[PDB]
Amino acid sequence: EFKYSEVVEPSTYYTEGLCEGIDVRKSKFTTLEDRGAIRAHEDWNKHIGPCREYRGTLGPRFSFISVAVPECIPERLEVISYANEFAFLHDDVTDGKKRIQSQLFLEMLAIDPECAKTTMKSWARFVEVGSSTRFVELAKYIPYRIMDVGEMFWFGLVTFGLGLHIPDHELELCRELMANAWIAVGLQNDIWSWPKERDAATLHGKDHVVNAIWVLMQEHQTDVDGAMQICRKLIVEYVAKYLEVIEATKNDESISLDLRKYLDAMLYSISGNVVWSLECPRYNPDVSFNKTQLEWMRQGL
């Protein structure tokens, strides 16, 4: 079942109890994410503007894709990391000679035509219905944040990296079974991106912060630490909830073999998001990169 990654020893990483019952798996080719990610920096620095040693998907020990999508097809590992950085590089713009990224798309047709064609169209619904605020109730924030984190982007990204062909009729079915998983990673990110996003709202003149922490502070009339405790409590529960879905969806043949794989692959995106966000320079400024990672950022590839 797993032939592209290994299980990381539980006594070597911190979980904070936010992914109980899930193994932490790391891609056996993590150096491919580096080159793919760093080349996105260089292409950024060469075509749109300054970009050197950017803190995004990369980590010194756990890079996002290498640990969130550990069973990614090795030959596709570089190009997925290339796209993931541009995703990270664009979310910061959210918070033009850039149309010359058709080289990314055309590269994916050289690998898999049908998988890419759906993914590119999966990103159509993402980009086009993304541009179209301020939440004080959590029940209303969950539907929004589910989109704002990038579910459609991730769907097209993983399915290509795993080579999954889900029939067009299960597309509405799939999104209604990873609700608990997507709520989990959404609250997780809102906790660890909170400092950089709270600092962000301080400059724009924002009286609000589009973050679960701020939302909970308004809805429950509590402070920062009070919201953190509530948020962490919900994550554990929603993580548990999704784990029940897995055992229930283990044996249905009307379910695609691919979709059944994709549901299982969502587990390690949860455990991966935990170990990554706890170390990544994106949320942890004081953390430095690898010798190898730097040597390619400074000296190039």
Ligand X SMILES: NCCC(O)(P(=O)(O)O)P(=O)(O)O
Annotated binding site: 91, 95
Rounded least distance, CB 45 to Mg ion, Å: 21
Q: Which of residues 34-63 bind ligand X (CB under 6 A)?
A: none
Rounded least distance, CB 218 to Cl ion, Å: 29
CA–CA separation, 282 and 85 (whole Å): 12
Q: Compare residues 36 and 150 and give the one whose CB is closer to ligand X.
A: 150
Is 146 in contact with 183 (CB distance < 8 Å)? Answer: yes
Q: Which region, judged by CB under 6 A, interacts with ligand X, from 1-9, 143-151, 161-169, 217-225?
A: 143-151
If one asks whether residue 249 binds Cl ion (CB under 5 A), the answer comes out as no
Site size for ligand X, by CB under 6 A? Answer: 7
Residue with the CB atom nearest Mg ion in the bound state: 193
Per-residue binder mask for Mg ion (CB under 5 A), 135-174, x = binder: ----------------------------------------
If one asks whether residue 67 binds ligand X (CB under 6 A), the answer comes out as no
Is 116 in contact with 105 (CB distance < 8 Å)? Answer: yes
Tell which residue, 79, 131, 129, has the closest CA to residue 105: 79
Sign of CA dihedral 40, 187, 274, 269: negative
- The interface partner of residue 144, options being Mg ion, ligand X, Cl ion, none and the CB cut-off 5 to 8 Å by kind, is none
Q: Which region, judged by CB under 6 A, interacts with ligand X, from 142-150, 160-168, 173-181, 235-243?
A: 142-150
Q: Compare residues 66 and 189 and give the one whose CB is closer to ligand X.
A: 189
CA–CA separation, 143 and 84 (whole Å): 23
If one asks whether residue 15 binds Cl ion (CB under 5 A), the answer comes out as yes
If one asks whether residue 144 binds Cl ion (CB under 5 A), the answer comes out as no
If one asks whether residue 14 binds Cl ion (CB under 5 A), the answer comes out as yes
Rounded least distance, CB 16 to Cl ion, Å: 5
CA–CA separation, 80 and 113 (whole Å): 15
Q: Which of residues 190-219 bind ligand X (CB under 6 A)?
A: 193
What does the chain come to in residues? 301
CA distances from 77 to 33, 110, 217, 295 (A): 6, 14, 40, 20
CA–CA separation, 37 and 35 (whole Å): 5
Three-state SS for 85? helix
Three-state SS for 50? coil
Query: Any idea what DSSP says for residue 5?
Result: E
Rounded least distance, CB 192 to ligand X, Å: 7
Query: Any idea what DSSP says for residue 290?
Result: -
Binding-site residues for Mg(2+)? 91, 95
Site size for Mg ion, by CB under 5 A? Answer: 4
User: Which residues of this protein are in contact with Cl ion, per CB under 5 A?
Assistant: 14-16
